[PDB]
Short mmCIF file of C-alpha atoms in Angstrom, two decimals:
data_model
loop_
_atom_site.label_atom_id
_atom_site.label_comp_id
_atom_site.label_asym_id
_atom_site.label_seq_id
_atom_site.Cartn_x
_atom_site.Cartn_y
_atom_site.Cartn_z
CA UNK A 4 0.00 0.00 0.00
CA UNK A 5 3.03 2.67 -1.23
CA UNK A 6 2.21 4.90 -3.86
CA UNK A 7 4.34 4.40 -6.89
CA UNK A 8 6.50 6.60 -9.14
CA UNK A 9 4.15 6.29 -12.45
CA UNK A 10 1.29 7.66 -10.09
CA UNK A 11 3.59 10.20 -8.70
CA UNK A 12 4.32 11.19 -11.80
CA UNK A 13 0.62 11.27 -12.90
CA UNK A 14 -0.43 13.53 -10.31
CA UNK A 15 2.55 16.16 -10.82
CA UNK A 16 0.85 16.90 -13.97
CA UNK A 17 -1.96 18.77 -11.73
CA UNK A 18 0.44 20.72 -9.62
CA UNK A 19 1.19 24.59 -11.00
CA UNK A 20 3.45 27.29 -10.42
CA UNK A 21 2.26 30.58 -9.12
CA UNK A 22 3.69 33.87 -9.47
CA UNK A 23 2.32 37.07 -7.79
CA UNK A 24 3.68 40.31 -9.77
CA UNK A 25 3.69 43.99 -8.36
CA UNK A 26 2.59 46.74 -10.93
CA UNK A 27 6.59 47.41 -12.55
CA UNK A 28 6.00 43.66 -13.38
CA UNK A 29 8.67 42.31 -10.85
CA UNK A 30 8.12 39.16 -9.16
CA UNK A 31 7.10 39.35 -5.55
CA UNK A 32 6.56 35.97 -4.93
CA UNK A 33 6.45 32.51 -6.07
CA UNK A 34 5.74 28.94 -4.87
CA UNK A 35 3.46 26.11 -5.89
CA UNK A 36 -0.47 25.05 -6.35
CA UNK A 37 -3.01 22.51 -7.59
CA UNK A 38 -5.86 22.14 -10.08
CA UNK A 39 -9.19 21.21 -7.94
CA UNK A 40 -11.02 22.79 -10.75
CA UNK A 41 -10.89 23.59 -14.53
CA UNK A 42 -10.45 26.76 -13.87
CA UNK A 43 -9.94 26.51 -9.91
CA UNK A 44 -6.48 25.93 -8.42
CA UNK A 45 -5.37 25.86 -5.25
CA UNK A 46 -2.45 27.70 -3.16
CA UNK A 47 -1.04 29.41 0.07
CA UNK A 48 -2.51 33.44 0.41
CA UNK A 49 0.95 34.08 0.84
CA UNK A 50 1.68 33.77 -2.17
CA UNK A 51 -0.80 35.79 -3.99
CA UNK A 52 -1.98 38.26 -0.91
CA UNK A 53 0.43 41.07 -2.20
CA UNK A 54 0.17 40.50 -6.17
CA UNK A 55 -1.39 43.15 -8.08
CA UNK A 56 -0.92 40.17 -10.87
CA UNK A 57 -0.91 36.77 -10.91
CA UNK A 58 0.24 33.93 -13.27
CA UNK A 59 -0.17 30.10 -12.96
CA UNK A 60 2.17 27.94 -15.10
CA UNK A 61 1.18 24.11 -16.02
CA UNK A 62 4.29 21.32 -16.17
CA UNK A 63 3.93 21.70 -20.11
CA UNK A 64 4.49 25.38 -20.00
CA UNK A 65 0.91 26.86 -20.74
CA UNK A 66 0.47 30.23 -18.63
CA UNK A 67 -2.33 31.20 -17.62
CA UNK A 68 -3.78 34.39 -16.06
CA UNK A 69 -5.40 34.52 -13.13
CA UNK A 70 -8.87 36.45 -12.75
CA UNK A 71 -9.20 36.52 -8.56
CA UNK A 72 -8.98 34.93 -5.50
CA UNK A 73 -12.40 33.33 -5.50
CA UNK A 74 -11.82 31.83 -1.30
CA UNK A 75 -9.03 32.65 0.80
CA UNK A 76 -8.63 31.66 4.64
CA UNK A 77 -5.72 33.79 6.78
CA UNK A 78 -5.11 31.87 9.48
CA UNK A 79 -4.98 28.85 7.26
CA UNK A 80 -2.95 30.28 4.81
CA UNK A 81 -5.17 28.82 1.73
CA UNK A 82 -6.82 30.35 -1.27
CA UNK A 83 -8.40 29.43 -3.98
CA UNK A 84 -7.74 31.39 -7.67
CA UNK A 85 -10.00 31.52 -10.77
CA UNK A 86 -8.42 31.64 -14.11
CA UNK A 87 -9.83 33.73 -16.97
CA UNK A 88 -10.22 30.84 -19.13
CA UNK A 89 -10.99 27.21 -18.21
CA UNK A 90 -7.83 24.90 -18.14
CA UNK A 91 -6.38 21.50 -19.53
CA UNK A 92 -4.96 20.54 -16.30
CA UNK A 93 -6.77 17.44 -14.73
CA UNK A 94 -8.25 18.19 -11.06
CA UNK A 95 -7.46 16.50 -8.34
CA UNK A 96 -9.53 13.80 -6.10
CA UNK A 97 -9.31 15.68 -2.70
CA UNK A 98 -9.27 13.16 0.32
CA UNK A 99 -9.64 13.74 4.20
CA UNK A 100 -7.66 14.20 7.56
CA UNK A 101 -10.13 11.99 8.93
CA UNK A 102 -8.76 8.90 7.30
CA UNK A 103 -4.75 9.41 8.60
CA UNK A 104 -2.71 7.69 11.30
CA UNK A 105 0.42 8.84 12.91
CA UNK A 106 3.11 7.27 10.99
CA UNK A 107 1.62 6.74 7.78
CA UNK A 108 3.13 7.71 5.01
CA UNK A 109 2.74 11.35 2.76
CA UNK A 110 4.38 12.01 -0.49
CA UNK A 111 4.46 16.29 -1.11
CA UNK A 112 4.29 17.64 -4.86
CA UNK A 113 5.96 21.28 -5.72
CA UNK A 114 6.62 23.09 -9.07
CA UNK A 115 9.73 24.72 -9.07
CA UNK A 116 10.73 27.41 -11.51
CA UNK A 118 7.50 24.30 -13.99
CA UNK A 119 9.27 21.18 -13.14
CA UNK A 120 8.09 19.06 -10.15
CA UNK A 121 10.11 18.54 -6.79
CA UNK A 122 8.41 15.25 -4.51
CA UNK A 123 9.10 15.65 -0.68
CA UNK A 124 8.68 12.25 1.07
CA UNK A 125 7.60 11.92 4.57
CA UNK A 126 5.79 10.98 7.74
CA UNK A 127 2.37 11.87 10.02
CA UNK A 128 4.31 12.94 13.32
CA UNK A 129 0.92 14.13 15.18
CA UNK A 130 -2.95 14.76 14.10
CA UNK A 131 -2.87 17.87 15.41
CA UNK A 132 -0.58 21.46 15.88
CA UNK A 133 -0.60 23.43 19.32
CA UNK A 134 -1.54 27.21 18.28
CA UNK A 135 -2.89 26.28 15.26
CA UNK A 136 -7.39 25.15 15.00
CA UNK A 137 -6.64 22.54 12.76
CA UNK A 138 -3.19 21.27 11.35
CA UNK A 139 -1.03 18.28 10.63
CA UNK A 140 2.63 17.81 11.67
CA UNK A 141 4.65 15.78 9.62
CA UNK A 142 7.40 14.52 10.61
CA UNK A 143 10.24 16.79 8.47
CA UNK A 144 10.10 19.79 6.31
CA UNK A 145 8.95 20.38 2.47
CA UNK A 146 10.98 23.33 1.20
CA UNK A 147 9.69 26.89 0.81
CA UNK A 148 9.75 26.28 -3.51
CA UNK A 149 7.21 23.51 -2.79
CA UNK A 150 4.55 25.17 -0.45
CA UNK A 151 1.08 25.56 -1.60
CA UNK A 152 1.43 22.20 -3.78
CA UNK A 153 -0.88 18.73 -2.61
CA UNK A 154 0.29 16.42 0.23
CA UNK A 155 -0.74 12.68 -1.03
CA UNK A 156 -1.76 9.59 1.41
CA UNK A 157 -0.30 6.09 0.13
CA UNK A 158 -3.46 5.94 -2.02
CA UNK A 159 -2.91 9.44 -4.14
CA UNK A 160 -5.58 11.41 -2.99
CA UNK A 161 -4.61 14.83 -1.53
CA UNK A 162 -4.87 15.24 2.07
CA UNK A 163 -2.98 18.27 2.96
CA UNK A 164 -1.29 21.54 1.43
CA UNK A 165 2.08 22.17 2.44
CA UNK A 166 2.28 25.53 4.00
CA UNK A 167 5.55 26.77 5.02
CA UNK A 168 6.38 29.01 7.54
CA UNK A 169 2.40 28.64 9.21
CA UNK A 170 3.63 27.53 12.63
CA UNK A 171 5.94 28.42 15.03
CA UNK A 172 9.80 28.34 13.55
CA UNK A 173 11.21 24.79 12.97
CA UNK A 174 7.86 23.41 13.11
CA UNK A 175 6.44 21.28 9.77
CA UNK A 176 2.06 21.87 9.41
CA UNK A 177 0.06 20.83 6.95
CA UNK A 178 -3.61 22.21 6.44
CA UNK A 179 -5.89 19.91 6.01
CA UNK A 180 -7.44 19.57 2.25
CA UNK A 181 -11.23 18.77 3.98
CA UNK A 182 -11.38 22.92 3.73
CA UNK A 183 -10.46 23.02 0.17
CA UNK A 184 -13.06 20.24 -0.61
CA UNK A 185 -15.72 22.23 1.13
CA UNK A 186 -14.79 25.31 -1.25
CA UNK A 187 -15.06 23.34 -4.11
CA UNK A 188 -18.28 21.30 -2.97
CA UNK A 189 -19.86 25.06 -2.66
CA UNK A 190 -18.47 26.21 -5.83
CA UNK A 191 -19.12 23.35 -8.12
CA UNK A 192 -22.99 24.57 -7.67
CA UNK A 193 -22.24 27.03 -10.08
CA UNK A 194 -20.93 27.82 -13.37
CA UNK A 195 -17.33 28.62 -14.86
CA UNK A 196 -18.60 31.72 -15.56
CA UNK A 197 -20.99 32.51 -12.65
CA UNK A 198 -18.12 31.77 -10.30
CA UNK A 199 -17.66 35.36 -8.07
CA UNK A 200 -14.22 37.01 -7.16
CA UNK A 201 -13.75 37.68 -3.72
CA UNK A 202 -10.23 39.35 -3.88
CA UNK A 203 -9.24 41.01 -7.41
CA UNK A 204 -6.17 40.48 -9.45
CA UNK A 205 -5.04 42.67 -12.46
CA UNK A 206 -3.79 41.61 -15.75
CA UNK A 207 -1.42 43.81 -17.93
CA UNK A 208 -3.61 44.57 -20.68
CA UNK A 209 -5.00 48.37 -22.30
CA UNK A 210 -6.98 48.96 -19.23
CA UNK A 211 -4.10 48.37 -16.50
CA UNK A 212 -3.32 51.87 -16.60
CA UNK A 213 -6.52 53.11 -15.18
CA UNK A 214 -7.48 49.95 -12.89
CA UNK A 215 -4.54 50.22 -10.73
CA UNK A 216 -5.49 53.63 -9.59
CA UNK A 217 -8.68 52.05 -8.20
CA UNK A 218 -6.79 49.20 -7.21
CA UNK A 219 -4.03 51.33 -5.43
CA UNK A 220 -6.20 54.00 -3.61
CA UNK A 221 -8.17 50.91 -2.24
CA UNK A 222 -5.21 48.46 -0.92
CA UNK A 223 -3.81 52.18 0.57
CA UNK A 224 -7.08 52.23 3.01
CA UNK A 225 -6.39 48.14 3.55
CA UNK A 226 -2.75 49.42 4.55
CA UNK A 227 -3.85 52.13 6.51
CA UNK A 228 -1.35 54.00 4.22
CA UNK A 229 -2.96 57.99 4.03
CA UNK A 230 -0.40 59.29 2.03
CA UNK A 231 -0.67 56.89 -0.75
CA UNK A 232 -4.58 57.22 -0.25
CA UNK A 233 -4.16 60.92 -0.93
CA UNK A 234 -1.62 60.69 -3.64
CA UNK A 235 -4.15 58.37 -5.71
CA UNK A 236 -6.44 62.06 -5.82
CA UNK A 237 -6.17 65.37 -6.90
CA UNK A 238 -5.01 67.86 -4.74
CA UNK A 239 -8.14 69.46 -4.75
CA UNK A 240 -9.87 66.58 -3.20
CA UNK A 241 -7.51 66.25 -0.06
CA UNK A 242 -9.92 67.46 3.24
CA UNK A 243 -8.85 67.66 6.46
CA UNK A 244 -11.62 66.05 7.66
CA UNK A 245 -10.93 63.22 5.73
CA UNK A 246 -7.66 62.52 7.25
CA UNK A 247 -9.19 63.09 10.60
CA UNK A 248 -11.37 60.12 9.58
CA UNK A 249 -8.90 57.96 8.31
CA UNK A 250 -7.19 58.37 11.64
CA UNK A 251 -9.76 57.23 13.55
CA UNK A 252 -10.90 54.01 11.36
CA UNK A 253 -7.24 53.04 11.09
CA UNK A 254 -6.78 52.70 14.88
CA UNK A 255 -9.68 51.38 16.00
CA UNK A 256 -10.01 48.46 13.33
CA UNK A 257 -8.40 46.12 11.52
CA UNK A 258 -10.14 45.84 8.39
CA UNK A 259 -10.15 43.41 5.09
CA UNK A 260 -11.30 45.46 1.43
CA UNK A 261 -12.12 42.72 -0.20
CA UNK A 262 -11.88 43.20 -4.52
CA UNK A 263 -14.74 41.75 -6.15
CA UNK A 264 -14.50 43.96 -9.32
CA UNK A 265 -12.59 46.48 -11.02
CA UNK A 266 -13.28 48.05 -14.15
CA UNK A 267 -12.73 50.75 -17.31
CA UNK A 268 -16.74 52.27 -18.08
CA UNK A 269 -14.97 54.89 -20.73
CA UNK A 270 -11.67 56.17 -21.15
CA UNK A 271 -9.18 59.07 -23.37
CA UNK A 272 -6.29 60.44 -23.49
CA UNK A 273 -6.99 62.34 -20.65
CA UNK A 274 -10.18 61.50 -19.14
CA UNK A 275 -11.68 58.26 -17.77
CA UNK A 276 -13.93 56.30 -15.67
CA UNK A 277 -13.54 53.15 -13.17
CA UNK A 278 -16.56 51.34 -11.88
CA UNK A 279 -15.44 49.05 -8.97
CA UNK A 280 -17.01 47.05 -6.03
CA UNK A 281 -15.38 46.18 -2.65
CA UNK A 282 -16.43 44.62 0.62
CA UNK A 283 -15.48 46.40 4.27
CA UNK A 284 -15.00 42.82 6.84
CA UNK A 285 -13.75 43.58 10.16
CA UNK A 286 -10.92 41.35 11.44
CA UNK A 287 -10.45 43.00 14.79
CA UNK A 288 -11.71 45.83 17.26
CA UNK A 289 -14.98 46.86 18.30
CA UNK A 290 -18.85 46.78 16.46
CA UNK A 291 -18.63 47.43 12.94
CA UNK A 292 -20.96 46.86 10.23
CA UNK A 293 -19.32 44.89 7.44
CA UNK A 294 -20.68 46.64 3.88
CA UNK A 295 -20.40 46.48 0.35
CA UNK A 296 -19.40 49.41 -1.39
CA UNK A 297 -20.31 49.42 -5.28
CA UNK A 298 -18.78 52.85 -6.75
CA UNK A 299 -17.28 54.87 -10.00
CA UNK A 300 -14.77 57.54 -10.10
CA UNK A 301 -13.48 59.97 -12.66
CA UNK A 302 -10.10 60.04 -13.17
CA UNK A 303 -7.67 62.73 -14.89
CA UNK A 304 -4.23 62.76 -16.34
CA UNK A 305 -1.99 65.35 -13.86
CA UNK A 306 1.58 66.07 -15.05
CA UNK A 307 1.27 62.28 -16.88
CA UNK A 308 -0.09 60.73 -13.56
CA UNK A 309 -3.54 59.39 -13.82
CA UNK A 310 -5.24 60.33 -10.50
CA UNK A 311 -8.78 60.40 -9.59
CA UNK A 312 -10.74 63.95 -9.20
CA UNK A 313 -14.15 62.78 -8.31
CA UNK A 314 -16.17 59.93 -7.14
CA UNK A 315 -19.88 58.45 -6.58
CA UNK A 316 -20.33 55.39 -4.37
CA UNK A 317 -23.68 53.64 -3.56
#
């Protein structure tokens, strides 16, 4: 009851690379992730939390580009992307903790920079102090390989790796029975009718004006004022507005979720963004988590797009 090379090999042909770019098209960062979908793959939020855009690569080469984050859990360090077209890479049967005994044997798949890496190894303990719900193993999977499947002897995925999610020096696994319950949810609905929870970019005509919208948004997620401000005309600074800011950004800690942004009309220089974000409170006292569906004019200043008005709803 070992699981052989030729199925090893088999189920490599699932696992992707992802790579999270900032807006000067550098690479931020980079690790590894699974199909669980045709258009649905699955990775560490690590890895794409701080990419403005994000590619996934297949082990034949084919990039693709990624449309959102579609799930994401924090404390579990898991997300789920959407592609903007549907994929040839073959899903993969997701199995459960419930079925593992200390001891048994795991086999860990990573795509390193698109050829695969396998990490063999050992259940150490069903269970990881600080963390709800993790697996130890019983030695680590390297940093290239994290956000790739974690196979039982029978080849069906029971973890994801996730590096770094525990105290130092300590090896945890998530559990894939909250990836399967994403993808139980999701599979209710179409390619197409699948909803973005957090927004990624692509570098297309349109970039230029999106990541103004984009920018002015992940400032108020940073609690970052001056970039905030520097995303508007001068004109529309207030004092009271800082004041404001001030206040929100000490009392809360706050999640602006993406689920759209995009160009309504645009010139040479004159345009306008529609977008639509979500306000969740992570921390502090009562607050109202709301939806904020909105479109803003923006102008070109000295050959910097910025945005001089704005109508939200």
């Amino acid at each position: 009851p070992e699981l052989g090379s030729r199925e090893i090999e088999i189920l490599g042909e699932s696992v992707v690379l992802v790579t999270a770019y900032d807006e000067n098209r550098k690479v931020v960062s980079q690790g590894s992730g699974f199909a669980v979908g045709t258009g649905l793959f699955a990775t560490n939020y690590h890895l794409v939390k701080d990419g403005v855009v994000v590619k996934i690569t297949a082990g034949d080469g084919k990039v693709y580009d990624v449309d959102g984050i579609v799930k994401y859990d924090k404390a579990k360090d898991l997300a789920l992307l959407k592609t903007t077209v549907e994929t040839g890479v073959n899903p993969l049967k997701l199995g459960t903790k419930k079925s593992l005994t200390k001891g048994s044997r795991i086999v860990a798949i990573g795509k390193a920079n698109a050829k695969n890496t396998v990490t063999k190894g050992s259940i150490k303990s069903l269970k990881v102090d600080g963390l709800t719900d993790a697996i130890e193993l019983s030695a680590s999977i390297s940093k290239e390989s994290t956000g790739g499947p974690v196979f039982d002897m029978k080849g069906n995925v029971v973890g994801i790796t996730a590096y770094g999610i525990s105290k130092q020096n300590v090896n945890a696994v998530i559990p894939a029975d909250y990836v399967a319950d994403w993808v139980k949810e999701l599979s209710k609905h179409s390619f197409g009718n699948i909803r973005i929870v957090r927004k990624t970019l692509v570098f297309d005509s349109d970039f230029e004006f999106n990541f103004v919208v984009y920018k002015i948004i992940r400032a108020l997620e940073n609690e970052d004022a001056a970039t905030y401000f520097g995303c508007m005309t001068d004109e529309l600074y207030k004092d009271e507005t800082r004041k404001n800011l001030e206040v929100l950004f000490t009392t809360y800690d706050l999640a602006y979720n993406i689920e759209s942004i995009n160009v309504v009309s645009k010139s040479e220089e004159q345009a306008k963004v529609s977008y639509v974000y979500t306000i969740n409170k992570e921390a502090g006292p009562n607050f109202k988590n709301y939806r904020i569906i909105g479109e803003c004019s923006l102008i070109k200043v000295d050959g910097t797009w910025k945005i001089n008005d704005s109508e939200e709803k």
